[PDB]
Amino acid sequence: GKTGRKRRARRKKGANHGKRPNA
Amino acid sequence: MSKLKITQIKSGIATKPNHRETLRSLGLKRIGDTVIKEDRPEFRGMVRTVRHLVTMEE
Amino acid sequence: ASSSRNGRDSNAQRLGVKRFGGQLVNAGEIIVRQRGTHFHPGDGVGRGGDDTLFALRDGNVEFGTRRGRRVVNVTPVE
RNA sequence: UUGAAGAAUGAGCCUGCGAGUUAGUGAUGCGUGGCGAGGUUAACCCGUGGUGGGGGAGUCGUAGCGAAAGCGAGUCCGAUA
RNA sequence: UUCUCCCCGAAAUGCAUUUAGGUGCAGCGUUGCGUGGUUCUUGUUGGAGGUAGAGCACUGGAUGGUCUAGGGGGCUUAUCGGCUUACCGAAAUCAGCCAAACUCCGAAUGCUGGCAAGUGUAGCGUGGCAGUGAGACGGCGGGUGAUAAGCUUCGUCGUCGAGAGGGAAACAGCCCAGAUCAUCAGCUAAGGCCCCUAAGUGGUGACUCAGUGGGAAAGGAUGUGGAGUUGCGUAGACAACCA
RNA sequence: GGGCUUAAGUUAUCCGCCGAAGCUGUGGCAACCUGUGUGGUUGGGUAGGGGAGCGUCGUGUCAGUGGUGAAGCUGCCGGGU
RNA sequence: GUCGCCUCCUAAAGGGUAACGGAGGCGCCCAAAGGUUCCCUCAGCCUGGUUGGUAAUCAGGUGGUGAGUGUAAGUGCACAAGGGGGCUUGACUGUGAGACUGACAGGUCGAGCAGGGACGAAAGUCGGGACUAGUGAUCUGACGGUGGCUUGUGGAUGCGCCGUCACUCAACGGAUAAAAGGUACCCCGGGAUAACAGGCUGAUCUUGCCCGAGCGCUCAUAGCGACGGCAUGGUUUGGCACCUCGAUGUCGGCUCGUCGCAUCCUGGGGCUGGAGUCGGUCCCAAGGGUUGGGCUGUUCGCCCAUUAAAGCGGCACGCGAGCU
RNA sequence: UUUCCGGUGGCCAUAGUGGAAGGGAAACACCCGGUCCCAUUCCGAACCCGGUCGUUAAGCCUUCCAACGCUGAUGGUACUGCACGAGGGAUCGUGUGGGAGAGUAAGACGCUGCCGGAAU
Ligand SMILES: [Mg+2]
Ligand SMILES: [Mg+2]
Ligand SMILES: [Mg+2]
Ligand SMILES: [Mg+2]
Ligand SMILES: [Mg+2]
Ligand SMILES: [Mg+2]
Ligand SMILES: [Mg+2]
Ligand SMILES: [Mg+2]
Ligand SMILES: [Mg+2]
Ligand SMILES: [Mg+2]
Ligand SMILES: [Mg+2]
Ligand SMILES: [Mg+2]
Ligand SMILES: [Mg+2]
Ligand SMILES: [Mg+2]
Ligand SMILES: [Mg+2]
Ligand SMILES: [Mg+2]
Ligand SMILES: [Mg+2]
Ligand SMILES: [Mg+2]
Ligand SMILES: [Mg+2]
Ligand SMILES: [Mg+2]
Ligand SMILES: [Mg+2]
Ligand SMILES: [Mg+2]
Ligand SMILES: [Mg+2]
Ligand SMILES: [Mg+2]
Ligand SMILES: [Mg+2]
Ligand SMILES: [Mg+2]
Ligand SMILES: [Mg+2]
Ligand SMILES: [Mg+2]
Ligand SMILES: [Mg+2]
Ligand SMILES: [Mg+2]
Ligand SMILES: [Mg+2]
Ligand SMILES: [Mg+2]
Ligand SMILES: [Mg+2]
Ligand SMILES: [Mg+2]
Ligand SMILES: [Mg+2]
Ligand SMILES: [Mg+2]
Ligand SMILES: [Mg+2]
Ligand SMILES: [Mg+2]
Ligand SMILES: [Mg+2]
Ligand SMILES: [Mg+2]
Ligand SMILES: [Mg+2]
Ligand SMILES: [Mg+2]
Ligand SMILES: [Mg+2]
Ligand SMILES: [Mg+2]
Ligand SMILES: [Mg+2]
Ligand SMILES: [Mg+2]
Ligand SMILES: [Mg+2]
Ligand SMILES: [Mg+2]
Ligand SMILES: [Mg+2]
Ligand SMILES: [Mg+2]
Ligand SMILES: [Mg+2]
Ligand SMILES: [Mg+2]
Ligand SMILES: [Mg+2]
Ligand SMILES: [Mg+2]
Ligand SMILES: [Mg+2]
Ligand SMILES: [Mg+2]
Ligand SMILES: [Mg+2]
Ligand SMILES: [Mg+2]
Ligand SMILES: [Mg+2]
Ligand SMILES: [Mg+2]
Ligand SMILES: [Mg+2]
Ligand SMILES: [Mg+2]
Ligand SMILES: [Mg+2]
Ligand SMILES: [Mg+2]
Ligand SMILES: [Mg+2]
Ligand SMILES: [Mg+2]
Ligand SMILES: [Mg+2]
Ligand SMILES: [Mg+2]
Ligand SMILES: [Mg+2]
Ligand SMILES: [Mg+2]
Ligand SMILES: [Mg+2]
Ligand SMILES: [Mg+2]
Ligand SMILES: [Mg+2]
Ligand SMILES: [Mg+2]
Ligand SMILES: [Mg+2]
Ligand SMILES: [Mg+2]
């Protein structure tokens, strides 16, 4: 799903270091 | 013996309990705290164990 | 639906070496719990009914080879 | 509640009211006071004048071990082990 | 389930349960008394191992080759015996392989002793009082599941829970960092410096022209820069143009 | 998000700065440790444990006070962690 | 289906470690299959040999563990713990330094000593079995022994102690000695937990795509697309149990629309074509339009008569404080 | 003292396996008997007893042979503690420590203690 894909891809932001709650 | 100079540059939060206990044994208590230790292999070992948290000099 | 013909297991028995090399022991102290003689009784070490190796005397535990066997000895304390 | 600004619950508003109490010479700690190898009374009696005095029956401490007879700084299992 | 502040500060685990949203015991909190480096970290020194990896000694799985017992098909024709065996083929052997329940091997770590140094005031004994025994996500190593789930169930560390502040547009669990109060001082962390928005429309050298940056696969494509190897070539190459 | 290729994109590198309740400076408070002239360490916090208090009502005692105005209510000006 | 116990794997080289994870076993057996002492070495293979064959018994050669082990599996065991003979009862009584392992109940090992034995020339070994399952707390009752106690005394009787017995208490830490069902007539915390919707996921479904065996007289690619491969969508069936159980009303029609384009018609264009007429297919394109009836509660579907056409989907499978 | 040999340990293949050559003074051994102790789940084969004639054929001993097996670095690689990083995702990379297995060069036809023997 689009929402799931965006949620998973949000972990690629700079301040996060490849990790994010709920992937 | 060259009197190693060790200062803490990163916090102990979220580090491993090994690393936190190593900092305690080195006597560092805050970020920016500095201690002087002899050029002894045990202290070199502590420094290399927490090498990502401290910097060392002479 | 379906079912499993498995799910049974035995309780943990807690085998293994209980006193490692150089560790000071008293007479009668258990050195290793085991099934079969993976370690044979050496000098100063007795073997029990369930193949437990225990100390026959005070001293330090060492692991070695006696002829062709892996053995556990208790060197008498200096 | 893993997680609530939550579209989970309750509350319209104010004022008043509304939930860890009390009784045991209960059990067990602690603080403190008294006395101390002793401590302490209960009922009850006297004080119609009370909160004071008497009352040591009891009760805890003073020796333990054993199922017990028993023995006792030992005792019990045991063979005076 | 009603006033305040000071100090410390959890658990959502194990075992058992007519038990599973309850409870007892242990774990973890606090506190009195006692014992004092016994704890912990690092170094050094010594132990037991069978995981990762790897391997084919074993047990299974397996590809091809050689070779072959022995089975199938034929005839001459068979009681044989022969031609065949151009078909099948155990085993053995050669070469390449596979494995949570394979191992001739075998780490890193971890665990556990001795010694040394460092160290908060850690550890331990024994009493008083608990709460908790519904966990969550992330990293790493696994099982269940479909190479699924913000899934489920373990190992381990972290945060959240019970954590404000900075970053992540917003955004319990990610990153930085643990808030004693005051300050219209300074330096930094992560992250940032065109404007929103504090600080560089920074310097120098490359690349991109797709708004790629600012989501995606098998596959496809004279996009573009750079680095090779190699064939042919002023015996005259590749195109274009006359037989 | 505006907008950005005339990078405000990617990348290598160099020089600066911004940036938190982190660190430092300064002032106040507090817990604990220590030889007791110093100083050191510490003070996010739910369930929960420990410690010390504020306010209300009654009451023993002492000192009182009140129609030259108590309680209560309600302003203002102050005080304490 | 499972519940206690044992072995292996999962288990991440100590120990421990969960799932309705993956494999199996146990509720015994043995008077020798226990103790001791001495002796022995297997399976397989090759050769020869009456019956006799792959394989009985025999001989020689080879062969170190691939046989064997009462019984699962692992760890062991060839020095044998495997095979055989002799003699035996230690498958003892009184004990247990010191440890292992559990929250505990508990589970396990054990040197040394005494008594009285077995075996061995002795050294020595023997408190069952190569090891680890073959088991059940307490209560209550029972039998044997003992004689501690006995309510005035002596008896008796009863009890205590020691040994032992009686539970598929198998839901195996064992609620009672004693127990099955119905509730749509039902009544009185949880979104800790199901049905509906939302969310995640995308197996399935769906829509594409890559490869091109083949089919298409001929001719992979007019048009098709085998075997395989890669994804989209989130509307199908599911998986999950995150939201709501101090209420998020659940099918179809009616009414009112709005949005997507994966276009039914109308508009445009390629390739084929295709004589023309028509068609079919890959692009563009969502402006407008997209009928009325029979059957069934239906969605779906079939049918009748039309039409330029009778599209597919989203909006809590749009829309019950709008209706049905 | 040395050499050689017989016993009895230790390391447990660098020692084994296989092939070749040679040796016995004491010793070991095969060998010769079974009368005697004793013995065969039959057998004086073995065990045991009595001899040491015969014999180095074998055991045993010495020398030689890397042939099978065994031993085996250095360097690299896998993996990995800690710290990070990159992909839509299976998964991958780097820093800092540790670091195999296999394979390669190579080693190796054993080493060592005590007692006894015959000679020196
Ligand atoms: Mg999808
Ligand atoms: Mg035994
Ligand atoms: Mg036994
Ligand atoms: Mg919830
Ligand atoms: Mg609300
Ligand atoms: Mg609201
Ligand atoms: Mg509720
Ligand atoms: Mg309400
Ligand atoms: Mg109210
Ligand atoms: Mg008296
Ligand atoms: Mg605190
Ligand atoms: Mg592997
Ligand atoms: Mg508890
Ligand atoms: Mg519970
Ligand atoms: Mg739980
Ligand atoms: Mg759970
Ligand atoms: Mg958990
Ligand atoms: Mg996790
Ligand atoms: Mg998995
Ligand atoms: Mg989860
Ligand atoms: Mg909570
Ligand atoms: Mg926290
Ligand atoms: Mg925060
Ligand atoms: Mg923030
Ligand atoms: Mg913010
Ligand atoms: Mg600055
Ligand atoms: Mg920075
Ligand atoms: Mg703003
Ligand atoms: Mg510029
Ligand atoms: Mg610039
Ligand atoms: Mg594009
Ligand atoms: Mg884009
Ligand atoms: Mg792409
Ligand atoms: Mg500041
Ligand atoms: Mg601060
Ligand atoms: Mg300061
Ligand atoms: Mg505090
Ligand atoms: Mg703080
Ligand atoms: Mg509290
Ligand atoms: Mg007056
Ligand atoms: Mg009053
Ligand atoms: Mg383990
Ligand atoms: Mg481990
Ligand atoms: Mg668990
Ligand atoms: Mg036997
Ligand atoms: Mg018995
Ligand atoms: Mg003991
Ligand atoms: Mg057991
Ligand atoms: Mg005896
Ligand atoms: Mg005798
Ligand atoms: Mg047996
Ligand atoms: Mg036996
Ligand atoms: Mg009962
Ligand atoms: Mg009487
Ligand atoms: Mg007895
Ligand atoms: Mg049970
Ligand atoms: Mg019962
Ligand atoms: Mg009815
Ligand atoms: Mg109800
Ligand atoms: Mg839920
Ligand atoms: Mg709940
Ligand atoms: Mg649902
Ligand atoms: Mg909803
Ligand atoms: Mg669904
Ligand atoms: Mg579910
Ligand atoms: Mg769950
Ligand atoms: Mg409501
Ligand atoms: Mg279109
Ligand atoms: Mg339309
Ligand atoms: Mg439009
Ligand atoms: Mg139908
Ligand atoms: Mg529609
Ligand atoms: Mg609906
Ligand atoms: Mg409505
Ligand atoms: Mg090697
Ligand atoms: Mg190597």
Automatic annotation (TrEMBL), chain B:
Gene3D superfamilies: Ribosomal protein L30, ferredoxin-like fold domain. GO terms for cellular component: cytosolic large ribosomal subunit. Residues 4-54 form the Large ribosomal subunit protein uL30-like ferredoxin-like fold domain. Keywords: Ribonucleoprotein, Ribosomal protein. It holds the Pfam family Ribosomal_L30. One of its GO terms (molecular function) is structural constituent of ribosome. One of its GO terms (biological process) is translation. NCBIfam families: rpmD_bact. This is Large ribosomal subunit protein uL30. Belongs to the universal ribosomal protein uL30 family. Part of the 50S ribosomal subunit. Coiled coil: none annotated. The keyword Ribonucleoprotein applies.
Automatic annotation (TrEMBL), chain C:
The lineage of its organism: Bacteria, Bacillati, Actinomycetota, Actinomycetes, Propionibacteriales. Signal peptide: none annotated. Residues 1-13 have a biased composition (Polar residues). Belongs to the bacterial ribosomal protein bL27 family. One of its GO terms (cellular component) is cytosolic large ribosomal subunit. The keyword Ribonucleoprotein applies. Keywords: Ribonucleoprotein, Ribosomal protein. This is Large ribosomal subunit protein bL27. The gene is rpmA. One of its GO terms (molecular function) is structural constituent of ribosome. Gene3D superfamilies: 2.40.50.100. The keyword Membrane does not apply. SUPFAM superfamilies: Ribosomal L27 protein-like. It comes from the Bacteria. GO terms for biological process: translation. Residues 1-16 are annotated as: Disordered. InterPro entries: Ribosomal_bL27, Ribosomal_bL27_CS.
